[PDB]
Amino acid sequence: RTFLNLTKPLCEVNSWHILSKDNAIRIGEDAHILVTREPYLSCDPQGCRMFALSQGTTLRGRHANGTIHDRSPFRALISWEMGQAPSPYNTRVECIGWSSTSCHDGMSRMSICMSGPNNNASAVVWYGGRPITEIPSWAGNILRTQESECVCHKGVCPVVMTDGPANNRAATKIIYFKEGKIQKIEELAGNAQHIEECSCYGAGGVIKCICRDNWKGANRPVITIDPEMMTHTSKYLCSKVLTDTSRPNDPTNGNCDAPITGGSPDPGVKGFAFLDGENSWLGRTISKDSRSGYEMLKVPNAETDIQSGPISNQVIVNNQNWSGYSGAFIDYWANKECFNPCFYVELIRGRPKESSVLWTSNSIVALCGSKKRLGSWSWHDGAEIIYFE
Amino acid sequence: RTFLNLTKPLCEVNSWHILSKDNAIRIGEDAHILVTREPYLSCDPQGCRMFALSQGTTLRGRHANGTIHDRSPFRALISWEMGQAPSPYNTRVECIGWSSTSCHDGMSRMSICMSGPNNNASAVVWYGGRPITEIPSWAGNILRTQESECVCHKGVCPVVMTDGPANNRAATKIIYFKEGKIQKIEELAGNAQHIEECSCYGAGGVIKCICRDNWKGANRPVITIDPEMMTHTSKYLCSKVLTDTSRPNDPTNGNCDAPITGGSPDPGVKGFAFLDGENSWLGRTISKDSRSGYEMLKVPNAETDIQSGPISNQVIVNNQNWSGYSGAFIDYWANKECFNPCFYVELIRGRPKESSVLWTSNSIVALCGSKKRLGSWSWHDGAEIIYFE
Amino acid sequence: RTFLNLTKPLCEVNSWHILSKDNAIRIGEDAHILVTREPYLSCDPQGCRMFALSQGTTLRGRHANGTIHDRSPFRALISWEMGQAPSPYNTRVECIGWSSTSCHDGMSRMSICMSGPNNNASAVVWYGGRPITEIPSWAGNILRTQESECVCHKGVCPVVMTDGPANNRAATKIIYFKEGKIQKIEELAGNAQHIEECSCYGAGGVIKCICRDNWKGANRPVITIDPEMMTHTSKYLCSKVLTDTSRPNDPTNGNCDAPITGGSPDPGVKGFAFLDGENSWLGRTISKDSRSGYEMLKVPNAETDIQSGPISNQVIVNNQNWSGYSGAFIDYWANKECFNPCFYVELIRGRPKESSVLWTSNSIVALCGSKKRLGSWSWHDGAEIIYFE
Amino acid sequence: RTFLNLTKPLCEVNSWHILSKDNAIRIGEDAHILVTREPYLSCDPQGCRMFALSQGTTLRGRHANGTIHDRSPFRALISWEMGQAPSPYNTRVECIGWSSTSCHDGMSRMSICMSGPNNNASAVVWYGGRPITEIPSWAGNILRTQESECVCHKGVCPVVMTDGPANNRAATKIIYFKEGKIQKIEELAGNAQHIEECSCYGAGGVIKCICRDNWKGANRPVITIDPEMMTHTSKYLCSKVLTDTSRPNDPTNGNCDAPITGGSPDPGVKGFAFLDGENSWLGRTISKDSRSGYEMLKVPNAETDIQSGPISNQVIVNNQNWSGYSGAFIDYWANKECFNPCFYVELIRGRPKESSVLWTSNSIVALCGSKKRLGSWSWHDGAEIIYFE
Ligand SMILES: CC(=O)N[C@H]1[C@H]([C@H](O)[C@H](O)CO)O[C@@](O)(C(=O)O)C[C@@H]1O
Ligand SMILES: CC(=O)N[C@H]1[C@H]([C@H](O)[C@H](O)CO)O[C@@](O)(C(=O)O)C[C@@H]1O
Ligand SMILES: CC(=O)N[C@H]1[C@H]([C@H](O)[C@H](O)CO)O[C@@](O)(C(=O)O)C[C@@H]1O
Ligand SMILES: CC(=O)N[C@H]1[C@H]([C@H](O)[C@H](O)CO)O[C@@](O)(C(=O)O)C[C@@H]1O
Ligand SMILES: CC(=O)N[C@H]1[C@H]([C@H](O)[C@H](O)CO)O[C@@](O)(C(=O)O)C[C@@H]1O
Ligand SMILES: CC(=O)N[C@H]1[C@H]([C@H](O)[C@H](O)CO)O[C@@](O)(C(=O)O)C[C@@H]1O
Ligand SMILES: CC(=O)N[C@H]1[C@H]([C@H](O)[C@H](O)CO)O[C@@](O)(C(=O)O)C[C@@H]1O
Ligand SMILES: CC(=O)N[C@H]1[C@H]([C@H](O)[C@H](O)CO)O[C@@](O)(C(=O)O)C[C@@H]1O
Ligand SMILES: *[C@@H]1O[C@H](CO)[C@@H](O)[C@H](O)[C@H]1NC(C)=O
Ligand SMILES: [Ca+2]
Ligand SMILES: [Ca+2]
Ligand SMILES: [Ca+2]
Ligand SMILES: [Ca+2]
């Protein structure tokens, strides 16, 4: 056991293979499955786990009614063995709250959750399963964070947090942790105009966080973090291939340093990309308006070229099925000379798009890169809504 | 592993951060969750766990009917991973009976349960998960104990027990254990006139037990124990801020050495406080009459000053929601230079306050000290009783 | 770490303290609890576990219907953490069949199950979780064994087995195992005329098995086994206090060497006793006709004196409640200078005594000796049969 | 821990003893049990586990409806502790997909699953719980594999795969893995004309794979693999005792080098055999037409003599009960001088044979060889289909 160092480059990726799928809604139709949303996966030296914000009720329970609501005193971050569906019997409570992140540094796991009222939230930072630090809201408006895993290097794990408006300038900070203790706090710098729900990974000693601009941009903000110097820079993804949801049609040219407006009717969704020159892949919903479908697009130089377009594609979820948030993770402890990109897609079921039921929940699908040319099919949730009526 | 020694001082506390909530009643409305009461938490070198007295049925089961009853041959102390809800599938039986205490001495856990008929109860003392000692009733009237964790120092774990009337003078003893064997027994001494359900913690080589006087006082008795000499003193919390339930209004002056009587209609409830000069916090139900709401009041010198009032407060459970028992615990194995205060609140649902159902049970919330000034909100149970009708 | 040696003497016993109780039937009214019968307990260096023969269905399942039947291809020996109820989620399948025994030699656990048709059953002997040895029926009539734990000394664990009529002379053997391999087989010798379902325990290098004579005696046969020499003798309990069920009134004198007959209407039930001169205790159903109630009786010199009677008694289950099989076990790995006797009572619910349901199952209660004079109460099953109607 | 090698000989087998049975359909009538099919068992240094392809839904759930269907994005290979029934709470996801194999090389477990659309399937190869290698379909027609365990020798684990028509010549390959990495690929060679679903086992440094010819033969193809040279040969079982399902009556002579045609109405079923000169056993369904009943036949020189007939038999499942797939496995880590043959029988319930329900699933029974002459009885599933109507 030692601290993880981000000493390896990203593996070449040409295709995406299936890693895990929990079929939670299908199973939760009759088994005791907790309602969730905002899932992800995170790994450690022993393997990978799935994570999500429980709503403190089962899917078939009468308390599933009303779970469209994002914040309550009944939510908590829970983790479970990858592949299983989350039940009250197989899940570990990482922390209490309604927004979270988590990562392993090679020694222990840090987990963070925000809870409390809108104008007075606080974060609690846990390490090795114990509470270490507490951070009060600094802008009095829903202190909140990534909703996917953080990334560590030589013991130092940066985390992106925001507090302030969802539709206006907000106060974002990069907080650098070691064993759950604050090493440094920076205010967000650079040209990104709004930051939410960053999806982050590391490679070659560099951490990149592709985030959600909920205020103006249909293009995604990118923050580049040096976890050794504990400094960062920010801007937008340059590609004309817009990846936020509710975006206009892709334009002739993207914009590296300003948001591209437009889209209807959603201001944003969590998402991700892996940016590695020619070896760059962008995820997005297939629908430009809604959280339906999901596609991976290989867009060489998407980080630096406003003219970059797709040279290959892979449908992860067809546009006849619902998707949701998407984010990045990597099994940094794999026995490979490169760090292989993985991602998950949250498959939201229920409200508001399916209003024949009273609840909102999701299942999870996750895939990682392949150098091979693999065939594919749609990994939709798979549940029949009529069965819940 | 080594014996825990109470060598550290209490951490400074200015507010309370969320530690855990199990949402047991919400989840138990449709998953297989045990009916409980008298819950608490207790930690060890590896972490913290939740404890409670099962009723030997699930919340939705037909045998949940009648569970307002406190004592039966179908109760047992159970423990389980912090944050999970107590099911028949994830709970460890610590011992059999209907009143208990438990604590880890740094090497192993000691667990104690009382069972039997009112006029002939006995305690069984467990250590390392094996029964070590048995203790028969000495006053033939519901031999009973703490209903929250005991505390250990150099292997010596004092426990406060009582046998005798609930509504008149009784026979309290402090029994000193090491590896589940009786080292010494003392009869209660000092100015506390009635002792029940003590909530105890350790700091700076001194163990403090804040208890319930079910006979006269609305102020809580306080026993101070020297675990090395195995001797003690007792009196009452000096503060005018009364913390028992069914208490009258706070008077102008409290009384260190005599009970402050009054209040209606109930003689008492298990509660707690941390007492450390200016760094003192008293918990109580917000209602002076019923087990509803729960608030933490910072009252400097509450332990010694009859005129001490609150300088701050934090609502833990709003007064439109049910509370219950409350008690102290500490993660004595945390990687801190001080012992940080934690507490839990039992959130009782069902009878007698909610008679639309035939059962009585509870969920749990737990919080710990923070040196920061954190925002707060209500951590009420969150179940809808109508769903159970 | 090492093979257990039976070198310690039995602890002095003056009353019985509660060890465990699973409340399976109460819990199983709603939770997913397996139908069982023929339970017992058995310990190893880490702790104690509960055992029983599942019927391959849950209590509330439609397949619980018809579970009065003793033998099917759907039964198996399962073990689980002491105190929990047996569910499909927390039980380990030891082996497959419809008669069993099990014991730990200090290194690993041996478990044995018989299965197959009446005229052609077979035993499979398991060790450390792997199948070691198979034993075919020698008399073509329901090869069967103890239905409670065996006992090992220096790695040698003798097991008593019977093959032959239940209501006439049969063929009993003592098979000595080591690591699941047969070391020696002996034909039953001595004065016991019929042997079934032996309840065995060890002390001072000697193993005593108290059994059920289903053919003639209402007094119980006693087999004494020397595990080093691998030899034995047999006779009956001498006491006039008869302990099998469906017995006549206790006569003026018992008989050391021949069966005391009589009783109505059933030939036998599994039972046990601890025999240590003055320190001797006999368990039996309170009713002399049916398996109801259960009492422990201290009968000095029960093993040698035909006029020995009780000098103390403890009611374990009141005569208004159903009991069932009873058997011996000891936690040989306790941190004590003596081996402390323990026993369990099988609490049978359903058919044939409770015919308003279609199933037969049980719950378990277990107790151990105390040197103290402890109060007591009835530890009956606690389920309300009407809730299953 | 070392790499396992196959130098030991097969144990002599004269009868079959019961190893395990999970009773999953009986139990799943009321507990939360996953719908499965294509089960098997596989062992490692610690013991054995049960495997199967889940359908991503419980047996009682509404999504059970439609589970006759073999391939969907909702299936996954799951493993669990031998003897338990597969629930959402005790199952490990080995990989995602609708065809699999798995085996332990003495150091870690390799698991492989195929998923994707019929024309573009892909395999993901896992080792030690991590994804290692991906393989795209090469014939573009349902790439598929063994549905029972693979076998490893000195780090090398051969796997047989097929891609192509089910009803005509297809493209079978042997792929040799080491730590999940491809060491070599071979096209099928020899006189076997069609290969599906091989049941494989090792002894004397040689792996034999007994398969299913779904195109022509009612006799079973046999593939002999040398795991050191990484080469193979193929032909058919010589015996007149035909072991596929939907076969004609046994002819007077079998055929070592060509398929024997006939039987109605089904083209084949996964099965197995142990081939060891005189010590040879063939399994098959009792019915020549349908997947009903199951018998083991000892047929000396079945691998080499076309006139070889049975010299003994054992009924495993009577012909009044449904059977299904059957396959081979061995506990190669047993403490024995020889490798003892084991096998399982999949017990299919529901569609198409039991059309009164909407689902298809199964339970499992497994047996291993014995040198003794043990009696036997039928180990059928035991659920009442009426209870599911
Ligand atoms: C802390 C919190 O409530 N986060 C919520 C965020 C915010 O609403 C937006 O990022 C605006 O800040 O996104 C969601 O609401 C959403 O769009 O589904 C889900 C998530 O629970
Ligand atoms: C899951 C689904 O049905 N998605 C469909 C959506 C939704 O019906 C609307 O977004 C509802 O507002 O509409 C589309 O035009 C889109 O947005 O891509 C087509 C897509 O197939
Ligand atoms: C052993 C026992 O019965 N303890 C019970 C005590 C006593 O009744 C009082 O302390 C009076 O002695 O408090 C309760 O009843 C109560 O107030 O809810 C709960 C608890 O179960
Ligand atoms: C949980 C709850 O509703 N509490 C309410 C109680 C209860 O109605 C009574 O205690 C029932 O006896 O009444 C109050 O006046 C009080 O006690 O402060 C107001 C409080 O909001
Ligand atoms: C193997 C077997 O069937 N054992 C059964 C035995 C025998 O019937 C008797 O000992 C007569 O041999 O006792 C029972 O039937 C019984 O009385 O409740 C239960 C047990 O299952
Ligand atoms: C559990 C129970 O009800 N036991 C009762 C039994 C049974 O009813 C009969 O044995 C059934 O045949 O009858 C008694 O006379 C007896 O045996 O002592 C009284 C006892 O209270
Ligand atoms: C990958 C796949 O679908 N395998 C299926 C195979 C193929 O149909 C045949 O081997 C023909 O190739 O056999 C089954 O269908 C069957 O007979 O019950 C079950 C199994 O799921
Ligand atoms: C389980 C069962 O009932 N099997 C019966 C089968 C099936 O009914 C048919 O195969 C359905 O196609 O028919 C038989 O003639 C046979 O196959 O030997 C008799 C056998 O008892
Ligand atoms: C096979 O394993 C055995 C037992 O570990 C070992 O003695 C032998 O050297 C190995 N044989 C080969 C050929 O590797
Ligand atoms: Ca946006
Ligand atoms: Ca009081
Ligand atoms: Ca008898
Ligand atoms: Ca065929």
PDB file of N, CA and C in Angstrom, chain C residues 221-268:
ATOM      1  N   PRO C 221     -30.568 -43.649  27.534  1.00  0.00           N
ATOM      2  CA  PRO C 221     -29.291 -44.364  27.428  1.00  0.00           C
ATOM      3  C   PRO C 221     -28.069 -43.447  27.490  1.00  0.00           C
ATOM      4  N   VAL C 222     -26.976 -43.924  28.094  1.00  0.00           N
ATOM      5  CA  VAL C 222     -25.779 -43.144  28.247  1.00  0.00           C
ATOM      6  C   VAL C 222     -24.620 -43.949  27.634  1.00  0.00           C
ATOM      7  N   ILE C 223     -23.956 -43.369  26.636  1.00  0.00           N
ATOM      8  CA  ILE C 223     -22.732 -43.963  26.028  1.00  0.00           C
ATOM      9  C   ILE C 223     -21.511 -43.195  26.527  1.00  0.00           C
ATOM     10  N   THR C 224     -20.517 -43.891  27.033  1.00  0.00           N
ATOM     11  CA  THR C 224     -19.310 -43.214  27.509  1.00  0.00           C
ATOM     12  C   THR C 224     -18.156 -43.527  26.565  1.00  0.00           C
ATOM     13  N   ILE C 225     -17.541 -42.498  25.983  1.00  0.00           N
ATOM     14  CA  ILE C 225     -16.558 -42.732  24.950  1.00  0.00           C
ATOM     15  C   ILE C 225     -15.200 -42.234  25.382  1.00  0.00           C
ATOM     16  N   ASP C 226     -14.191 -43.077  25.201  1.00  0.00           N
ATOM     17  CA  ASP C 226     -12.792 -42.677  25.446  1.00  0.00           C
ATOM     18  C   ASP C 226     -12.220 -42.374  24.068  1.00  0.00           C
ATOM     19  N   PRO C 227     -12.028 -41.101  23.763  1.00  0.00           N
ATOM     20  CA  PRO C 227     -11.600 -40.682  22.426  1.00  0.00           C
ATOM     21  C   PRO C 227     -10.131 -40.992  22.091  1.00  0.00           C
ATOM     22  N   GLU C 228      -9.329 -41.345  23.104  1.00  0.00           N
ATOM     23  CA  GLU C 228      -7.912 -41.693  22.878  1.00  0.00           C
ATOM     24  C   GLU C 228      -7.752 -43.157  22.564  1.00  0.00           C
ATOM     25  N   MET C 229      -8.418 -43.998  23.344  1.00  0.00           N
ATOM     26  CA  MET C 229      -8.425 -45.437  23.136  1.00  0.00           C
ATOM     27  C   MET C 229      -9.387 -45.789  22.033  1.00  0.00           C
ATOM     28  N   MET C 230     -10.331 -44.875  21.751  1.00  0.00           N
ATOM     29  CA  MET C 230     -11.421 -45.146  20.782  1.00  0.00           C
ATOM     30  C   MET C 230     -12.201 -46.383  21.174  1.00  0.00           C
ATOM     31  N   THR C 231     -12.634 -46.396  22.447  1.00  0.00           N
ATOM     32  CA  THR C 231     -13.509 -47.469  22.955  1.00  0.00           C
ATOM     33  C   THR C 231     -14.698 -46.899  23.740  1.00  0.00           C
ATOM     34  N   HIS C 232     -15.689 -47.713  24.057  1.00  0.00           N
ATOM     35  CA  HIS C 232     -16.893 -47.166  24.749  1.00  0.00           C
ATOM     36  C   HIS C 232     -17.607 -48.232  25.601  1.00  0.00           C
ATOM     37  N   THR C 233     -18.509 -47.759  26.439  1.00  0.00           N
ATOM     38  CA  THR C 233     -19.444 -48.596  27.177  1.00  0.00           C
ATOM     39  C   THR C 233     -20.790 -47.904  27.134  1.00  0.00           C
ATOM     40  N   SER C 234     -21.869 -48.631  27.359  1.00  0.00           N
ATOM     41  CA  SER C 234     -23.186 -48.031  27.410  1.00  0.00           C
ATOM     42  C   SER C 234     -24.076 -48.635  28.508  1.00  0.00           C
ATOM     43  N   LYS C 235     -25.002 -47.803  28.991  1.00  0.00           N
ATOM     44  CA  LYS C 235     -25.981 -48.265  29.950  1.00  0.00           C
ATOM     45  C   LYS C 235     -27.096 -47.212  29.952  1.00  0.00           C
ATOM     46  N   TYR C 236     -27.875 -47.132  31.030  1.00  0.00           N
ATOM     47  CA  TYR C 236     -28.913 -46.098  31.102  1.00  0.00           C
ATOM     48  C   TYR C 236     -28.582 -45.154  32.226  1.00  0.00           C
ATOM     49  N   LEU C 237     -29.159 -43.934  32.188  1.00  0.00           N
ATOM     50  CA  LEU C 237     -29.207 -43.035  33.373  1.00  0.00           C
ATOM     51  C   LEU C 237     -29.824 -43.812  34.494  1.00  0.00           C
ATOM     52  N   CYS C 238     -29.221 -43.752  35.667  1.00  0.00           N
ATOM     53  CA  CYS C 238     -29.673 -44.597  36.830  1.00  0.00           C
ATOM     54  C   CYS C 238     -30.909 -43.949  37.513  1.00  0.00           C
ATOM     55  N   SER C 239     -30.923 -42.626  37.520  1.00  0.00           N
ATOM     56  CA  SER C 239     -31.962 -41.875  38.224  1.00  0.00           C
ATOM     57  C   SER C 239     -33.373 -42.367  37.943  1.00  0.00           C
ATOM     58  N   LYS C 240     -34.205 -42.340  38.970  1.00  0.00           N
ATOM     59  CA  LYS C 240     -35.650 -42.575  38.849  1.00  0.00           C
ATOM     60  C   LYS C 240     -36.354 -41.421  38.108  1.00  0.00           C
ATOM     61  N   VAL C 241     -35.671 -40.282  37.971  1.00  0.00           N
ATOM     62  CA  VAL C 241     -36.210 -39.124  37.210  1.00  0.00           C
ATOM     63  C   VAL C 241     -36.094 -39.396  35.704  1.00  0.00           C
ATOM     64  N   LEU C 242     -37.204 -39.796  35.096  1.00  0.00           N
ATOM     65  CA  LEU C 242     -37.274 -40.196  33.700  1.00  0.00           C
ATOM     66  C   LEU C 242     -37.261 -38.933  32.834  1.00  0.00           C
ATOM     67  N   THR C 243     -36.481 -38.931  31.745  1.00  0.00           N
ATOM     68  CA  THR C 243     -36.320 -37.698  30.956  1.00  0.00           C
ATOM     69  C   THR C 243     -36.627 -37.766  29.472  1.00  0.00           C
ATOM     70  N   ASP C 244     -37.057 -38.921  28.998  1.00  0.00           N
ATOM     71  CA  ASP C 244     -37.541 -39.000  27.637  1.00  0.00           C
ATOM     72  C   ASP C 244     -38.999 -38.547  27.614  1.00  0.00           C
ATOM     73  N   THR C 245     -39.557 -38.363  26.408  1.00  0.00           N
ATOM     74  CA  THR C 245     -40.931 -37.911  26.370  1.00  0.00           C
ATOM     75  C   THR C 245     -41.897 -38.844  25.728  1.00  0.00           C
ATOM     76  N   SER C 246     -42.963 -38.939  26.536  1.00  0.00           N
ATOM     77  CA  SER C 246     -44.040 -39.882  26.575  1.00  0.00           C
ATOM     78  C   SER C 246     -43.251 -40.792  27.475  1.00  0.00           C
ATOM     79  N   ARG C 247     -43.401 -40.485  28.749  1.00  0.00           N
ATOM     80  CA  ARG C 247     -42.862 -41.318  29.796  1.00  0.00           C
ATOM     81  C   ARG C 247     -44.006 -41.576  30.805  1.00  0.00           C
ATOM     82  N   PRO C 248     -43.841 -42.587  31.651  1.00  0.00           N
ATOM     83  CA  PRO C 248     -44.793 -42.785  32.747  1.00  0.00           C
ATOM     84  C   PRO C 248     -44.376 -41.898  33.908  1.00  0.00           C
ATOM     85  N   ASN C 249     -45.144 -41.895  34.992  1.00  0.00           N
ATOM     86  CA  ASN C 249     -44.679 -41.281  36.251  1.00  0.00           C
ATOM     87  C   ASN C 249     -43.329 -41.846  36.682  1.00  0.00           C
ATOM     88  N   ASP C 250     -42.514 -41.010  37.306  1.00  0.00           N
ATOM     89  CA  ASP C 250     -41.224 -41.488  37.771  1.00  0.00           C
ATOM     90  C   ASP C 250     -41.482 -42.594  38.776  1.00  0.00           C
ATOM     91  N   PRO C 251     -40.839 -43.748  38.626  1.00  0.00           N
ATOM     92  CA  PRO C 251     -41.006 -44.851  39.579  1.00  0.00           C
ATOM     93  C   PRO C 251     -40.167 -44.578  40.886  1.00  0.00           C
ATOM     94  N   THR C 252     -40.223 -45.499  41.827  1.00  0.00           N
ATOM     95  CA  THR C 252     -39.538 -45.367  43.098  1.00  0.00           C
ATOM     96  C   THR C 252     -38.044 -45.481  42.857  1.00  0.00           C
ATOM     97  N   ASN C 253     -37.639 -46.342  41.922  1.00  0.00           N
ATOM     98  CA  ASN C 253     -36.225 -46.557  41.603  1.00  0.00           C
ATOM     99  C   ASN C 253     -36.020 -46.537  40.101  1.00  0.00           C
ATOM    100  N   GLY C 254     -34.931 -45.924  39.643  1.00  0.00           N
ATOM    101  CA  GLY C 254     -34.637 -46.050  38.229  1.00  0.00           C
ATOM    102  C   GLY C 254     -33.902 -47.375  38.002  1.00  0.00           C
ATOM    103  N   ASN C 255     -33.291 -47.541  36.838  1.00  0.00           N
ATOM    104  CA  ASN C 255     -32.571 -48.747  36.540  1.00  0.00           C
ATOM    105  C   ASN C 255     -31.348 -48.392  35.702  1.00  0.00           C
ATOM    106  N   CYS C 256     -30.164 -48.634  36.246  1.00  0.00           N
ATOM    107  CA  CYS C 256     -28.881 -48.325  35.575  1.00  0.00           C
ATOM    108  C   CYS C 256     -28.708 -49.127  34.310  1.00  0.00           C
ATOM    109  N   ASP C 257     -29.273 -50.336  34.250  1.00  0.00           N
ATOM    110  CA  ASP C 257     -28.851 -51.274  33.180  1.00  0.00           C
ATOM    111  C   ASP C 257     -29.922 -51.820  32.312  1.00  0.00           C
ATOM    112  N   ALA C 258     -31.115 -51.259  32.432  1.00  0.00           N
ATOM    113  CA  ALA C 258     -32.232 -51.752  31.660  1.00  0.00           C
ATOM    114  C   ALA C 258     -33.281 -50.615  31.531  1.00  0.00           C
ATOM    115  N   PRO C 259     -34.064 -50.666  30.462  1.00  0.00           N
ATOM    116  CA  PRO C 259     -35.029 -49.599  30.198  1.00  0.00           C
ATOM    117  C   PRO C 259     -36.186 -49.606  31.169  1.00  0.00           C
ATOM    118  N   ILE C 260     -36.582 -48.407  31.588  1.00  0.00           N
ATOM    119  CA  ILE C 260     -37.803 -48.229  32.356  1.00  0.00           C
ATOM    120  C   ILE C 260     -38.829 -47.889  31.301  1.00  0.00           C
ATOM    121  N   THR C 261     -39.818 -48.762  31.105  1.00  0.00           N
ATOM    122  CA  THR C 261     -40.778 -48.592  29.988  1.00  0.00           C
ATOM    123  C   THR C 261     -42.049 -47.939  30.386  1.00  0.00           C
ATOM    124  N   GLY C 262     -42.911 -47.714  29.390  1.00  0.00           N
ATOM    125  CA  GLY C 262     -44.190 -47.073  29.627  1.00  0.00           C
ATOM    126  C   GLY C 262     -44.310 -45.719  28.949  1.00  0.00           C
ATOM    127  N   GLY C 263     -45.489 -45.114  29.080  1.00  0.00           N
ATOM    128  CA  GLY C 263     -45.736 -43.797  28.584  1.00  0.00           C
ATOM    129  C   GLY C 263     -46.578 -43.799  27.329  1.00  0.00           C
ATOM    130  N   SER C 264     -47.214 -42.655  27.060  1.00  0.00           N
ATOM    131  CA  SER C 264     -48.149 -42.546  25.936  1.00  0.00           C
ATOM    132  C   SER C 264     -48.301 -41.085  25.512  1.00  0.00           C
ATOM    133  N   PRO C 265     -48.489 -40.806  24.221  1.00  0.00           N
ATOM    134  CA  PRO C 265     -48.492 -41.814  23.159  1.00  0.00           C
ATOM    135  C   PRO C 265     -47.222 -41.915  22.265  1.00  0.00           C
ATOM    136  N   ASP C 266     -46.149 -41.205  22.568  1.00  0.00           N
ATOM    137  CA  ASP C 266     -44.999 -41.208  21.605  1.00  0.00           C
ATOM    138  C   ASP C 266     -43.766 -41.900  22.161  1.00  0.00           C
ATOM    139  N   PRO C 267     -43.015 -42.589  21.311  1.00  0.00           N
ATOM    140  CA  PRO C 267     -41.866 -43.404  21.756  1.00  0.00           C
ATOM    141  C   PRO C 267     -40.622 -42.612  22.205  1.00  0.00           C
ATOM    142  N   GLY C 268     -40.527 -41.291  22.007  1.00  0.00           N
ATOM    143  CA  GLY C 268     -39.226 -40.681  22.269  1.00  0.00           C
ATOM    144  C   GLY C 268     -39.080 -39.250  21.762  1.00  0.00           C
TER     145      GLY C 268
END
